Amino acid sequence: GSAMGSKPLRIGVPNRVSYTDYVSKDKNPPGVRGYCIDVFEAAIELLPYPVPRTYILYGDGKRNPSYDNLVNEVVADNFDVAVGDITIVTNRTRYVDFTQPFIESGLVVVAPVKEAGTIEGIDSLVTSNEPIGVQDGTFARNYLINELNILPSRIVPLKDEEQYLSALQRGPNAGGVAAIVDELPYIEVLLTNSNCKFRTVGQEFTRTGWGFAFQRDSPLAVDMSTAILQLSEEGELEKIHRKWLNYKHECS
Amino acid sequence: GSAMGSKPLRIGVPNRVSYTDYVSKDKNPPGVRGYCIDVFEAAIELLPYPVPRTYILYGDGKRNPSYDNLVNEVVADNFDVAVGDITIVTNRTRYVDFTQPFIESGLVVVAPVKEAGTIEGIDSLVTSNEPIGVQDGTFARNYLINELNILPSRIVPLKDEEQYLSALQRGPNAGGVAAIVDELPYIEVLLTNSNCKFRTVGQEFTRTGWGFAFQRDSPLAVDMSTAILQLSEEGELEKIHRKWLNYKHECS
Numbered sequence: 001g002s003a004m005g006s007k008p009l010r011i012g013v014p015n016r017v018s019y020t021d022y023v024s025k026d027k028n029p030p031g032v033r034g035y036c037i038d039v040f041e042a043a044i045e046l047l048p049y050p051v052p053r054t055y056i057l058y059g060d061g062k063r064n065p066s067y068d069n070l071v072n073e074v075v076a077d078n079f080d081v082a083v084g085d086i087t088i089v090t091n092r093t094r095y096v097d098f099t100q101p102f103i104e105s106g107l108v109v110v111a112p113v114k115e116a117g118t119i120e121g122i123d124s125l126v127t128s129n130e131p132i133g134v135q136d137g138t139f140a141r142n143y144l145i146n147e148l149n150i151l152p153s154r155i156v157p158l159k160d161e162e163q164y165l166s167a168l169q170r171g172p173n174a175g176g177v178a179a180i181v182d183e184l185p186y187i188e189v190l191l192t193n194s195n196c197k198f199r200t201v202g203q204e205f206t207r208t209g210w211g212f213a214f215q216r217d218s219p220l221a222v223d224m225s226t227a228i229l230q231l232s233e234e235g236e237l238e239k240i241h242r243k244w245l246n247y248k249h250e251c252s
Numbered sequence: 253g254s255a256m257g258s259k260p261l262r263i264g265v266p267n268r269v270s271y272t273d274y275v276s277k278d279k280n281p282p283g284v285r286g287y288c289i290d291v292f293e294a295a296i297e298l299l300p301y302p303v304p305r306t307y308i309l310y311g312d313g314k315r316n317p318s319y320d321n322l323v324n325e326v327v328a329d330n331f332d333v334a335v336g337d338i339t340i341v342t343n344r345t346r347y348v349d350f351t352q353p354f355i356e357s358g359l360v361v362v363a364p365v366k367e368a369g370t371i372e373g374i375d376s377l378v379t380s381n382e383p384i385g386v387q388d389g390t391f392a393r394n395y396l397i398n399e400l401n402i403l404p405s406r407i408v409p410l411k412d413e414e415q416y417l418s419a420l421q422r423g424p425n426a427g428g429v430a431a432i433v434d435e436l437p438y439i440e441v442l443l444t445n446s447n448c449k450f451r452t453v454g455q456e457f458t459r460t461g462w463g464f465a466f467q468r469d470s471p472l473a474v475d476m477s478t479a480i481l482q483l484s485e486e487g488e489l490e491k492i493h494r495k496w497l498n499y500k501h502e503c504s
């Protein structure tokens with residue numbers, strides 16, 4: 001009581017193997033780095049109390065982990081919060097308190113410039129019956145199946161940037177994919193590093209955001225929402241974005 | 253107990269005198285109409301329990317009411333929820349539980365096409381020292397003063413579409429304004445009905461959204477966030493948007 005001090009916050013962080021500028025492991029303390037970590041730390045700093053905290057990596061380090069499962073670790077009280085590129089989707093809001101979003105997100109279709117005549121957006125992709133690439137561990141798999149009625153066998157999980165590019169280059173008739181469905185923040189990074197061979201086709205066809213996932217009725221969730229809005233209004237969210245993400249490439 | 257039935261939810265609704273397609277009074281029940289009302293009703297319908305509810309108009313019907321005060325009526329327990337075009341801003345999240353946003357929003361600068369050389373965005377507007385138009389009752393007044401360091405005397409409240417157009421047309425040297433600062437959803441409607449005389453200049457320089465404001469720790473807020481995300485993922489949010497807002501005009 002008098003002798004025994006406070007537990008620290010147990011923060012689950014996805015062990016990303018792709019798009020590591022958003023969030024990834026660090027060899028140095030605090031053991032994690034990236035856009036999402038700097039936003040979380042900047043928001044903590046704005047709180048009117050200290051928040052003793054430890055970061056714990058979630059995932060085998062081979063494939064991006066299940067973000068559905070990361071959030072359920074918060075629900076099961078194995079983490080106090082999940083911090084990272086965590087998409088706010090219906091099934092995840094049921095059991096946790098997400099903050100207000102700290103960045104806007106939504107799904108886009110990426111295809112070769114050559115293929116843009118036949119695959120011109122999500123609707124033409126649905127009807128084509130050709131393979132669709134997605135990241136490991138994304139909500140996008142169950143969104144495509146349940147919302148857009150895609151035959152599960154069509155959805156091909158891809159491990160990293162090499163497999164995203166490789167699958168798009170090989171195409172649907174040579175053990176690749178007709179398109180990748182992923183969130184715009186990841187695709188903005190992919191098109192910076194893919195030499196203008198690939199583009200978005202059609203409209204961004206979902207809209208949501210990334211948020212921090214706290215346990216139901218967490219007072220910390222409420223204050224961190226206020227902090228995030230403060231970061232946004234002060235222009236700090238854009239400053240942190242500019243530090244981690246430049247979207248300018250050699251063919252633009 | 254056995255005889256006495258449930259209170260209905262007391263829903264505060266802003267009595268808008270401009271941009272009435274977003275939310276406004278109705279001569280017929282339930283006494284309110286608009287985009288924000290249809291989103292709220294569609295979200296209620298998705299809940300796994302009934303929500304007996306009454307809508308109460310907030311504002312004198314002459315000027316748009318203080319949205320800061322509408323939210324504080326929820327805090328003070330005079331309303332159970334505030335429903336309408338309610339911007340999620342730091343000072344409002346302190347005491348209420350906003351839903352996840354049901355539409356994205358942010359501030360833009362509107363100026364005459366002629367004036368676009370001198371007023372080219374928020375930064376040039378700040379330094380110009382000329383009058384700035386805003387709606388009655390908007391968060392944007394205190395955002396401009398506290399965040400962008402605008403002398404309060406420069407901020408000119410305008411009553412309705414007639415005064416928005418009139419003030420922009422008269423300009424800063426004839427009892428008008430150099431520009432209007434307002435949220436993009438309202439400006440999208442203004443530029444549809446202003447004959448291509450006016451345009452946005454520079455980047456959208458804030459990002460947030462509209463949400464429904466529930467009392468702190470409202471379980472209804474949690475379920476309505478899930479419902480809103482469901483509406484978004486099913487494409488119902490866009491269907492309701494298309495019913496109330498068309499942005500196509502005769503010079504486009």
Ligand SMILES: N[C@@H](CCC(=O)O)C(=O)O
Pocket residue numbers: 064065067068085086087088135136137138139140183
């Ligand atoms: N942001 C995605 C995770 C992306 C991935 O699968 O690596 C989600 O929350 O589902």
Ligand SMILES: N[C@@H](CCC(=O)O)C(=O)O
Pocket residue numbers: 316317319320337338339340387388389390391392435
């Ligand atoms: N959406 C604005 C209100 C606009 C108005 O002033 O009419 C707010 O929440 O502050």
